[PDB]
Design an enzyme around this catalytic site. Structure first.
Site, PDB file in Angstrom:
ATOM      1  N   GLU A   1      57.820  43.186   4.301  1.00 12.81           N
ATOM      2  CA  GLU A   1      58.522  42.199   5.129  1.00 12.81           C
ATOM      3  C   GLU A   1      59.871  41.701   4.599  1.00 12.81           C
ATOM      4  O   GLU A   1      60.056  40.496   4.383  1.00 12.81           O
ATOM      5  CB  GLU A   1      57.587  41.008   5.354  1.00 12.81           C
TER       6      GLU A   1
ATOM      7  N   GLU B   1      48.229  47.542   9.488  1.00  9.61           N
ATOM      8  CA  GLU B   1      47.416  46.335   9.635  1.00  9.61           C
ATOM      9  C   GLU B   1      47.094  46.009  11.085  1.00  9.61           C
ATOM     10  O   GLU B   1      47.192  44.862  11.519  1.00  9.61           O
ATOM     11  CB  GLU B   1      48.160  45.172   8.982  1.00  9.61           C
TER      12      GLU B   1
ATOM     13  N   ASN C   1      56.834  48.369   4.242  1.00 10.91           N
ATOM     14  CA  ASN C   1      55.898  47.802   5.213  1.00 10.91           C
ATOM     15  C   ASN C   1      56.420  46.513   5.835  1.00 10.91           C
ATOM     16  O   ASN C   1      56.964  45.658   5.139  1.00 10.91           O
ATOM     17  CB  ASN C   1      54.553  47.539   4.517  1.00 10.91           C
TER      18      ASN C   1
ATOM     19  N   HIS D   1      50.686  44.091  14.289  1.00 11.62           N
ATOM     20  CA  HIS D   1      49.919  42.898  14.628  1.00 11.62           C
ATOM     21  C   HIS D   1      50.381  42.529  16.034  1.00 11.62           C
ATOM     22  O   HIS D   1      51.382  41.834  16.199  1.00 11.62           O
ATOM     23  CB  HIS D   1      50.223  41.757  13.651  1.00 11.62           C
TER      24      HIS D   1
ATOM     25  N   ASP E   1      45.661  45.015  14.547  1.00  7.82           N
ATOM     26  CA  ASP E   1      44.757  44.086  15.202  1.00  7.82           C
ATOM     27  C   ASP E   1      45.480  43.702  16.484  1.00  7.82           C
ATOM     28  O   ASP E   1      46.701  43.506  16.498  1.00  7.82           O
ATOM     29  CB  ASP E   1      44.373  42.852  14.362  1.00  7.82           C
TER      30      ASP E   1
END
Ligand SMILES: O[C@@H]1[C@@H](O)[C@H](O[C@@H]2CO[C@@H](O)[C@H](O)[C@H]2O)OC[C@H]1O
Ligand SMILES: O[C@@H]1[C@@H](O)[C@H](O[C@@H]2CO[C@@H](O)[C@H](O)[C@H]2O)OC[C@H]1O
Ligand SMILES: O[C@@H]1[C@@H](O)[C@H](O[C@@H]2CO[C@@H](O)[C@H](O)[C@H]2O)OC[C@H]1O
Ligand SMILES: O[C@@H]1[C@@H](O)[C@H](O[C@@H]2CO[C@@H](O)[C@H](O)[C@H]2O)OC[C@H]1O
Ligand SMILES: O[C@@H]1[C@@H](O)[C@H](O[C@@H]2CO[C@@H](O)[C@H](O)[C@H]2O)OC[C@H]1O
Ligand SMILES: O[C@@H]1[C@@H](O)[C@H](O)OC[C@H]1O
Ligand SMILES: O[C@@H]1[C@@H](O)[C@H](O)OC[C@H]1O
Ligand SMILES: O[C@@H]1[C@@H](O)[C@H](O)OC[C@H]1O
Ligand SMILES: O[C@@H]1[C@@H](O)[C@H](O)OC[C@H]1O
Lengths: 436, 436
Positions: free
Chosen positions: A128, A236, A170, A207, A238
């Site tokens: 990030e 990641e 990432n 996300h 979701d």
């Protein structure tokens, strides 16, 4: 192999992973699901900066190795997460700046990768590094303040510490191609590859939620980064509400990209999720497979031989040749469904929703009143209960999420009027259906 | 007057109550809602057998009085629950049988009613005495085994203990006239009246779910009992899924029978429910009103003289004339909705579901990506989140359940293309919508 996500992914040379919480490895219900479904593991927090170097020069790889060992012993590869990040840094590092901080970063990267050298498939070296303001530029962190070249430095150090590990950048919110953040990261990676900066992959956290929804252009983003010569990985994943179509879409996006190494969902059960309120994973708290789970498995296995229905269609039993029908087009709650000669009529038009419901008349739902064999299958006002959610198996069976039982034509009946019930899945023809 | 459930119900000469749990009276958010919305209270467990007579001959009203005291202090009447029941009996009573049990039953009734003499509006003298095997006969319990006349004996005892209290027989699954259980209780009540057994009311628990769904014949059930010369009351109302229509139907049924005294929901917030899993009440865990709350209130106030859009339909703002429109009929999640000339297109066809959603395209939901003012209203995959639930107020406003904010045309916009957002309600024309 194709009864589990990991195995299904393996068919195409990919993996299907999850984020493992060291504290839950002692919960058999947790480990029973995790060891069976996934072949890639990411330590949810055990390999982060504050967890691996609580004190500068004082490395603690206890919790981290616990996760690593469990993974390998259970046939899973590992993604190291994460080496250089503005968030979750030990209190001591959060106070450093400039030259001192830059040095601590290098040391940390060397310490962790040294300890894990040759054991990690992918390392999220930098995490990030871009802001969400819309400028498309670096976020202001003590790390960035040490100079704009930190990211580049982190990757060079990384390659040095362990050349066998794939080094990834990432981040989140870099899935939608139209977003500035995405373009900012794209340009950097383009730059790095042109200047020879060591970087092998880009991780898209994925996300998704109403704030930053999934978009079909996500595949375009992956293909673009792929064209740069770097691998891509969904790190990641979701999805708020765990829509079946969205989960399947993200799955197909990766399968459509030759460089997409695999998919990792951020957690095992919804209750283990850092965002449980959004029930964004593939398993319920009770351990049962959610509608999206089957949607993902089916996608990994190669989809259907015939393009699936697009809202509002018939469901005919294989053994009977008759359709799922609501007697006399009744709309009263509690009406048990039956088999009847197929014909165009609302009471035979079922719509499979992303939440996993089989709707009729628009606001009525295929409903199971109970979880045992013989439970009558009826229509009831739609409300999102798990006894109103179903999984569409590729073998043609329809399984109730809550019960884990299959839609069954009573006594193997084939005549008009045969009622439908729930029953242990048997692969019988009175438990198989084809949708139009 | 017509702003709260209790006051609205009072306009038809009825009450609207809830079940209060003493351990929750210390929760300010709970009491705020409870005190404001209801004018009738039932102790959820504090006046039951085990709670009022821990050891034989030893009464204890501490827990019951906490509820009672709170009820009167906030101007609510009280329903005593419950005097004779096979369930939740203290251990010393569970051990009893025959004449010993019979007298214990009588002794319990005298002690509890004596304590509350003249303070209780209605007493659930006997609870769930009929079988649930679907035959309509007596439930097999130690009480029933003391002799078929135990129920009669309980009522005669109750009348003598407190002649001012209305004596009710309470039970569940006696709402559907076709069920054998419903008929068995009818026969008993009919027998009591003909023989002069004291009974003033019949409480219908009304615990509706897909196993025991609400049925329109409930109105006849109420009428049938009312005709025997007894009052009727919906005592423990909760609906699995909390369908807006079902909650409204029950309300209208009670209002359709002059002898229906009132309606009591079994709890305040879904989180307070003995079956939170079925999110069966009118208030969310955060304390916000659900779409069903509005449905109940509107029914209590008599409803509208103009029938709601039966499936599909457009939503046009008063101070805009334009209809809620999805830009270019797109289907991409995150697409902010707008206002536009009302044409015959699906990207303007909104369906208000019993769950409180405003669906377009069949499986896309009006979504709020936030709770504060200015939050853009868009469409997103339907998943049931409260940011996708809406309440259609009588003043033409549509307020978001989670946000508590109203749909609003940016800066009083009225021309085609004006974006829709969430803003504090204000009866402003840019927040009132009509549908036909
Ligand atoms: O800690 C980070 C969160 O702050 C971040 O939040 C995202 C901000 O943009 C919104 O559009 C997203 O919906 C929201 O999740 O997510 C990543 C996390 O690491
Ligand atoms: O347990 C929580 C973790 O699940 C969480 O993980 C982060 C979520 O946002 C992503 O952008 C990050 O990459 C990921 O590490 O971090 C906080 C922790 O408490
Ligand atoms: O309709 C139901 C049948 O589908 C069900 O079939 C059974 C499935 O499990 C097998 O082991 C049994 O042999 C087979 O009969 O039986 C019950 C019936 O109602
Ligand atoms: O304790 C009682 C329960 O046993 C009762 O259960 C009902 C039985 O009939 C089914 O059709 C219903 O779905 C089920 O709830 O409910 C009332 C409760 O007090
Ligand atoms: O807290 C729970 C109570 O809410 C529950 O109340 C009963 C529900 O079923 C009805 O048939 C009964 O009349 C009512 O008292 O009892 C159990 C308790 O744990
Ligand atoms: O650039 C992005 C913009 O396109 C999107 O609408 O909002 C987020 C920004 O970062
Ligand atoms: O539901 C059935 C209906 O579809 C058919 O047309 O007539 C018989 C009914 O039972
Ligand atoms: O979405 C709008 C569409 O419904 C209308 O027909 O043309 C203008 C568009 O913006
Ligand atoms: O349209 C909104 C108006 O209703 C509110 O009162 O003030 C802010 C505006 O954007």
């Amino acid at each position: 192999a194709e009864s589990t996500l990991g195995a299904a992914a393996a068919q195409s040379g990919r993996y299907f992973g999850t984020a493992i919480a060291s504290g839950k490895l002692g919960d058999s219900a947790y480990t029973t699901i995790a060891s069976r479904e996934f072949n890639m593991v990411t330590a949810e927090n055990e390999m982060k900066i504050d967890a691996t170097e609580p004190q500068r020069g004082q490395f603690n790889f206890s919790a981290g190795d616990r996760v690593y060992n469990w993974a390998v012993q259970n046939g899973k590869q590992v993604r190291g997460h994460t080496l250089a990040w503005h968030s979750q840094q030990p209190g001591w590092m959060q106070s450093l700046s400039g030259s001192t901080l830059r040095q601590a970063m290098i040391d940390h990267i060397n310490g962790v990768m040294g300890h894990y050298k040759g054991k990690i498939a992918q390392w999220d070296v930098v995490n990030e590094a871009f802001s969400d303001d819309g400028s498309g530029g670096r976020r202001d962190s003590n790390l960035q303040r040490t100079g704009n070249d930190w990211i580049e430095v982190a990757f060079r150090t990384a390659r040095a510490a362990d050349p066998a590990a794939k080094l990834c950048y990432n981040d989140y919110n870099i899935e939608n191609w139209t977003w500035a953040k995405t373009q900012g990261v794209y340009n950097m990676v383009r730059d790095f590859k042109q200047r020879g900066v060591p970087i092998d992959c880009v991780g898209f956290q994925s996300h998704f939620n109403s704030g930053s929804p999934y978009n079909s252009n996500f595949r375009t983003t992956l293909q673009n980064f792929a064209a740069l010569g770097v691998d891509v990985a969904i790190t990641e994943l979701d999805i708020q509400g765990a829509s079946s179509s969205t989960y399947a879409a993200v799955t197909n996006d990766c399968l459509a990209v030759s460089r997409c190494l695999g998919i990792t969902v951020w957690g095992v059960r919804d209750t283990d999720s850092w965002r449980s309120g959004d029930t964004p994973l593939l398993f319920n708290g009770d351990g049962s497979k959610k509608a999206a789970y089957t949607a993902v498995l089916n996608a990994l296995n190669g989809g259907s031989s015939t393009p699936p229905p697009s809202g509002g269609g018939q469901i005919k039993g294989v053994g009977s040749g008759r359709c799922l029908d609501v007697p006399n087009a009744s709309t009263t709650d509690g009406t048990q469904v039956q088999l009847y000669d197929c014909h165009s009529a609302t009471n035979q038009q079922w719509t499979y929703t992303d939440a996993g419901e089989l709707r009729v008349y628009g606001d009525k739902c295929l409903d199971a009143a109970g979880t045992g064999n013989g439970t009558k299958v009826q229509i009831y006002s739609c409300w999102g209960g798990d006894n109103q959610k179903w999984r569409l198996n590729s073998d043609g069976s329809i399984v109730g999420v809550q019960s884990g039982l299959c839609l069954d034509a009573v006594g193997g009946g084939t005549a008009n009027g045969t009622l439908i019930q729930l029953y242990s899945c048997s692969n019988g023809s009175n438990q198989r259906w084809t949708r139009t």
